[PDB]
Amino acid sequence: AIKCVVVGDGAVGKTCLLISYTTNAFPGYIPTVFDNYSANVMVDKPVNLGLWDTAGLEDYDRLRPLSYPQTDVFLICFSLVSPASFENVRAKWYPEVRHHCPNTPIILVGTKLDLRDDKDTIEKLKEKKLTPITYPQGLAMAKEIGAVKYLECSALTQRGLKTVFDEAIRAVL
Numbered sequence: 001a002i003k004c005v006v007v008g009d010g011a012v013g014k015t016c017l018l019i020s021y022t023t024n025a026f027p028g029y030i031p032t033v034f035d036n037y038s039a040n041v042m043v044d045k046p047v048n049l050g051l052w053d054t055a056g057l058e059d060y061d062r063l064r065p066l067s068y069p070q071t072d073v074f075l076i077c078f079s080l081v082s083p084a085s086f087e088n089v090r091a092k093w094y095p096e097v098r099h100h101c102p103n104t105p106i107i108l109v110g111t112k113l114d115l116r117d118d119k120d121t122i123e124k125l126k127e128k129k130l131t132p133i134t135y136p137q138g139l140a141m142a143k144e145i146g147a148v149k150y151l152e153c154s155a156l157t158q159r160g161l162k163t164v165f166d167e168a169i170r171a172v173l
């Protein structure tokens with residue numbers, strides 16, 4: 001099995017992405033405490049992928065890193081429509097992962113891709129003087145954190161969803 005650990009701010013869509021990917025179902029917001037999912041996947045070919053779905057809420061900061069030993073690949077996730085979560089990629093998640101796992105490959109994943117170029121979402125953000133994260137900004141952030149790939153997905157439409165796991169696996173094999 002490959003151990004893939006998924007981290008990122010509360011509500012960015014970690015659980016939706018894992019459940020959408022393993023089951024084709026879309027939940028179902030219940031904040032995660034901790035869950036383990038597993039998929040037998042064909043990449044490039046069969047793989048047992050163990051997915052560790054972590055708590056994004058700050059109450060679990062002291063506990064979350066207990067999950068980290070032995071990880072094969074990390075997914076650091078941020079919502080493409082939440083600039084705070086994007087800044088936390090380098091302000092919180094990158095350092096927390098690296099504190100514990102200096103070497104383990106990171107994939108940076110921008111989530112809720114279906115909302116990024118949604119007009120109502122862009123309007124609401126604009127009122128707040130903010131704008132969705134664009135692909136080149138995500139790429140710059142991937143570079144700044146030495147992520148091995150930057151990928152965008154939607155758990156809702158499944159755009160980009162398979163490639164996230166193909167690349168997590170390619171990162172390890």
Ligand SMILES: Nc1nc2c(ncn2[C@@H]2O[C@H](COP(=O)(O)OP(=O)(O)NP(=O)(O)O)[C@@H](O)[C@H]2O)c(=O)[nH]1
Binds near residue numbers: 011115157
């Ligand atoms: N529009 C859209 N909404 C999404 C998508 N993925 C998740 N959401 C919404 O964002 C909310 C948070 O989703 P969830 O996966 O539970 O977030 P989480 O990162 O696992 N939060 P926690 O760290 O607290 O477990 C849910 O209401 C969910 O339906 C998406 O791909 N598109």
Ligand SMILES: [Mg+2]
Binds near residue numbers: 030031054
């Ligand atoms: Mg969750």
